[PDB]
Amino acid sequence: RQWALEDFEIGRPLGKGKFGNVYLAREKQSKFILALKVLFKAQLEKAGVEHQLRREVEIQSHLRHPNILRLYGYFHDATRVYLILEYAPLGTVYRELQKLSKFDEQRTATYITELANALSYCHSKRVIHRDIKPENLLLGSAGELKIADFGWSVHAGTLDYLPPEMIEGRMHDEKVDLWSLGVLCYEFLVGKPPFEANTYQETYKRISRVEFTFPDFVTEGARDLISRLLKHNPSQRPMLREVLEHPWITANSS
Ligand SMILES: Cc1nn(C)cc1-c1nc2ncc(Cl)c(-c3cnn(Cc4cccc(C(=O)N(C)C)c4)c3)c2[nH]1
């Protein structure tokens, strides 16, 4: 059922990027609180990523999971294109990560579990999120994890979370999310991605050679899970099912 900008009351700016802007909004007749992401058609055409917005809508609208930010629908003004998303009251994991510096093993493995379930769901529907970052992770009213962005998501730039196979241009499958999950787990425990550098060029070879080191405070149980996930060879990477069954995850999930 088609919408309009006159059906909403726009509020606080939730986040701000170059693509567009995200605001808090409320539907006038139902008083429903939702996030209203605004996209401008002029840099949507200039970047020629009409596919992704079409794929973000097409994929995220039918995907339905407690750990996936729901897409309610969309519409477009004469000028810009407006997206109607679920509102996540407790904000991003990103800022939650820069305020706490790092996460403890319980909060970490809990996030990994919530992500695995959401990924085990997505994968069994032949969907690859590929772009798993903390900036795409939001928090629900109970503090649960919610995957948000699908603006690079398909069926089978910024490098820090991208696997060797993807950055070198090779054909990539649903195993690229297993790499991202490992990179994410690491960053949750340390506060910084395993392969971060000061240059795109250096980072590229950190990923390709798989060169990461553990600080001393990282437990052996975690070092094992991350090492299994960050294997250069996509076939050596565990299934999401054995990740859930991992001793460290099990002894430290909620
Ligand atoms: C933030 C925030 N604080 N509080 C109390 C609630 C929110 C919040 N609820 C949200 N619900 C849905 C969405 Cl799509 C968003 C949202 C908007 N931009 N973004 C992307 C983004 C990426 C990187 C940084 C930021 C940002 O502005 N901060 C402050 C972390 C944002 C996500 C949501 N953001």
Swiss-Prot record:
GO terms for molecular function: ATP binding; histone H3S10 kinase activity; molecular function activator activity; protein heterodimerization activity; protein kinase activity; protein kinase binding; protein serine kinase activity; protein serine/threonine kinase activity. The active site is at residue 131. There is a cross-link at residue 133 (Glycyl lysine isopeptide (Lys-Gly) (interchain with G-Cter in SUMO2)). It catalyses: L-seryl-[protein] + ATP = O-phospho-L-seryl-[protein] + ADP + H(+); L-threonyl-[protein] + ATP = O-phospho-L-threonyl-[protein] + ADP + H(+). ATP binds at residues 18, 37, 86-88, 135-136, 149. Residues 8-249 form the Protein kinase domain. Centrosome amplification can occur when the cycles are uncoupled, and this amplification is associated with cancer and with an increase in the levels of chromosomal instability. GO terms for cellular component: axon hillock; basolateral plasma membrane; centriole; centrosome; chromosome passenger complex; ciliary basal body; cytosol; germinal vesicle. It is found in: Cytoplasm, Cytoskeleton, Microtubule organizing center, Centrosome; Cytoplasm, Cytoskeleton, Spindle pole; Cytoplasm, Cytoskeleton, Microtubule organizing center, Centrosome, Centriole; Cell projection, Neuron projection. It comes from the Eukaryota. Induction: Expression is cell-cycle regulated, low in G1/S, accumulates during G2/M, and decreases rapidly after. This is Aurora kinase A. Belongs to the protein kinase superfamily. Ser/Thr protein kinase family. Aurora subfamily. The chain holds residues 126 to 388 of 403 of the full protein. Part of a complex composed of NEDD9, AURKA and CTTN; within the complex NEDD9 acts as a scaffold protein and is required for complex formation. Identified in a complex with AUNIP and NIN. Interacts with FBXL7. Interacts with CPEB1, JTB, TACC1, TPX2, PPP2CA, as well as with the protein phosphatase type 1 (PP1) isoforms PPP1CA, PPP1CB and PPP1CC. Also interacts with its substrates ARHGEF2, BORA, KIF2A, PARD3, and p53/TP53. Interaction with BORA promotes phosphorylation of PLK1. Interacts with CIMAP3. Interacts with GADD45A, competing with its oligomerization. The keyword Glycoprotein does not apply. The gene is AURKA. The modification Phosphoserine is found at residue 208. GO terms for biological process: anterior/posterior axis specification; apoptotic process; cell division; centrosome localization; cilium disassembly; G2/M transition of mitotic cell cycle; liver regeneration; mitotic cell cycle.
